[PDB]
Amino acid sequence: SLGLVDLKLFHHYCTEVWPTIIAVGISSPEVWGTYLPDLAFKYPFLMHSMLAFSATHLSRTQPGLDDYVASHRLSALKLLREAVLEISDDNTDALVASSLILIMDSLANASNSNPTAWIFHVKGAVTILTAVWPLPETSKFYNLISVDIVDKDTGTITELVCCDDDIADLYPVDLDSPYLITLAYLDKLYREKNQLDYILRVFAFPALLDRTFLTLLMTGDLGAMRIMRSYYKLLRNYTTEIMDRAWFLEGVSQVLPRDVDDYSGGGGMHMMLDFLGGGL
Amino acid sequence: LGLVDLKLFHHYCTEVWPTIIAVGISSPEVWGTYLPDLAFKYPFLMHSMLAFSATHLSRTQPGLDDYVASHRLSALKLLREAVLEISDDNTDALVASSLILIMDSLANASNSNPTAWIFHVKGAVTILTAVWPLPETSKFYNLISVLGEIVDKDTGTITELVCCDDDIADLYPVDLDSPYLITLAYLDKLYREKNQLDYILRVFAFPALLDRTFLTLLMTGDLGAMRIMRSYYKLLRNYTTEIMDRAWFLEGVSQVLPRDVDDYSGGGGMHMMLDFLGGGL
Ligand SMILES: CC(C)[C@@H](C)/C=C/[C@@H](C)[C@H]1CC[C@H]2C3=CC=C4C[C@@H](O)CC[C@]4(C)[C@H]3CC[C@]12C
Ligand SMILES: CC(C)[C@@H](C)/C=C/[C@@H](C)[C@H]1CC[C@H]2C3=CC=C4C[C@@H](O)CC[C@]4(C)[C@H]3CC[C@]12C
Question: Is A157 helix (H, G, I), strand (E, B) or coil?
């Protein structure tokens, strides 16, 4: 059930929006400019994500679209949360796709805005992504990850270039460690900053933690939490440095504090819970 | 409108207008940027465009017969309502849904179609007639239009032409006092531009850009004017069959345009003329 302004919003995407996605350092003009729009006709959930996104961008020059943005994001979150209950295999790329769009769009819509609303939308997208990962290798979206150096001359990580002084206490780490996988993931992603789709790898990281680590993290374990603070230093610094490059990362410095203790919704432990957790 | 309407606007932008350019038309800026943008300001242009692209998608996807017909009449209705209040701001909107509706009508006239495609074309033509002359500032100005060189410089008369020479010998010498001079020069110049870009659109606009003197003269059934239009008809018909092989929406137009106008499925040649020319005042 749509109007004339939706045709325009979709024209605004195929026309102007997705070139800006490519421009910040994403790959595949074919997925973003061809595959997505086609999938959108099949999955209302991705369609509502795409329209909300392009109306957020249009809000930049055309006035009067604040309710489109708001209303479309909501439908997208709703349809997206309902869609996760029944995951098929033909709707998997469409979910991944709308998840990433909802992330870009929520970071763009973080005016300050509590930040509970933007955080809540991102949460949904993290739960959808967590849900569908791992992706078949058949997925055109199976380059939002990385392959997987750590451990040397004693068979236990002794040094990581990713942060080195941020997890020292943990050093050294056994191959048995539950922290191993994440640390390798995180370090390997870090030595990948000068490459295409880095922004999307950085984006997907919280959803691609192994369940062991994650279930461990939600108990508030200190090692894991220290580990994630390293991811956070990477995310925040990568984001605030490219604000001029990406229109939708603008003002992200104002919504992501330096010290997680300064989280506006509570404490660091609260800032983890607002971002992680699906809905069983 | 709904989701199909969106997929359709999307279809236009991805596959319909590149085929318009491909036939021998210039300015991709008008057909893929200017029009879509105007389509948002003017619902009559919008319906024209969704009907066109659904006609083009109809060739493969089935079930849009309803879509094609619904958007085509609605465009006519608003287009026809829109000629009563022309402005300089909606004039290119009007020109462009005229040519769209013209192409969409040629694509929808069948192996043996009736008078519906023609009805629409008549509407397109009468809009066109009402907005011409376009201001030179219009983007469509060079796209749909275009003297002494037709005259023989040693006799002072139109001793001979290309294109219609055998067809209208009886008319010769044509003096500059004649009311057939502007049309004959226009037709000769139209022939003197075939390999050039936008020829199809010049050929298309010709009936709407006759001067009123000639036209009012033609609607009285005057034999001279009329023989002349038969020359335009030989040119329109002759071009469409060769480029029917190179353009999807001119397919089967020979089945609907007879070599003898006397074989008009609706009447005599004077009826074929009346069903294409004429307006609402
Ligand atoms: C914006 C998109 C990319 C989504 C996916 C990322 C959100 C970030 C801000 C979220 C994802 C995981 C969250 C996260 C996980 C774990 C902890 C450990 C805790 O002791 C302090 C908060 C902290 C560190 C939080 C901070 C906020 C994080 C880093
Ligand atoms: C298809 C689009 C391009 C529209 C504009 C053109 C329609 C054509 C087929 C119409 C336009 C003018 C019509 C036309 C005008 C005048 C006469 C004179 C008459 O004694 C015989 C019919 C005849 C020759 C008709 C035949 C059909 C014509 C040539």
Answer: strand
Tokens of B124: 């397109």
Task: Tell me if chain A has a CB within 8 Å of the CB of B5.
Answer: yes
Q: Cα separation of B12 and B104, whole Å? A: 12
DSSP H helices in chain A: 4-12, 18-23, 29-30, 36-40, 44-58, 66-85, 92-108, 116-132, 180-190, 198-204, 211-218, 222-241, 268-273
CA B13 to CA B36: how far, in whole Å? 8
Q: Do B6 and A4 touch (CB under 8 A)?
A: no
How far apart are the C-alpha atoms of A135 and B224, rounded to whole Å?
A: 75
User: How far, CA to CA in Å, does B144 sit from each of A111, A199, A238, B140, B259?
Assistant: 50, 49, 54, 6, 25
Encoding tokens for residue B127?
């809009």
**Cα B243 to the center of its chain, rounded Å:** 15
d(CA A123, CA A119): 6
Enumerate the domain spans of chain A.
4-132, 168-273
Nearest to B140 by CA among B131, B153, B151: B131
Q: How far apart are CA B191 and CA A163, in angstroms?
A: 75
Query: Residue B62: is the preceding peptide bond cis (ω within 30°)?
Result: no
Which two tokens mark A278?
A: 């699906």
Q: Which residues is A157 bridged to in the sheet?
A: A173
Dihedral sign of CA atoms B125, B127, B129, B135 in order: negative
Give the CB-side neighbour count of residue B43, counting CA atoms within 13 A: 13
Long-range contacts for A166-169 (Cβ within 8 Å, ≥24 apart)? A166/A226, A166/A229, A166/A230, A166/A233, A167/A223, A167/A226, A167/A227, A167/A230, A169/A226
Q: Which two tokens stand for residue B266?
A: 């609706």
Q: Which of B72, B86, B30 is nearest to B201 (CA)?
A: B30
DSSP B16: I
Q: What does the alpha-carbon distance between residue B166 and residue B161 come to, in Å, rounded to a whole number?
A: 9
The number of the ligand nearest the C-alpha atom of B220 reads 2
* Interchain contact B176–A (C-beta under 8 A): no
Residue whose entry in the numeric block shows the structure tokens 């789709």 = A197
The residue in chain A having the minimum alpha-carbon distance to the alpha carbon of residue B13 is A11
Asked if residues B23 and B247 have their Cβ atoms less than 8 Å apart, the reply is: yes
The answer to whether the CB of B224 falls within 8 A of the CB of B168 is no
Residue B40, CA distances (Å) to A7, A184, A276 in order: 9, 51, 42
Closest CA to B13 of A198, A10, A53: A10
How far is Cα B185 from Cα B262, in angstroms, rounded to an integer?
26
Q: How many CA atoms lie within 13 A of A107 on its CB side?
A: 22
CA distances from B133 to B22, B187, B210 (A): 27, 17, 10
The amino acid that residue A195 corresponds to is Q
Ligand 1 binding pocket includes A228 (Cβ within 6 Å): yes
Q: Three-state DSSP class for A173?
A: strand
Q: How far is the CA of B76 from the centre of ligand 2 (A)?
A: 20
- Å resolution of this model? 2.6
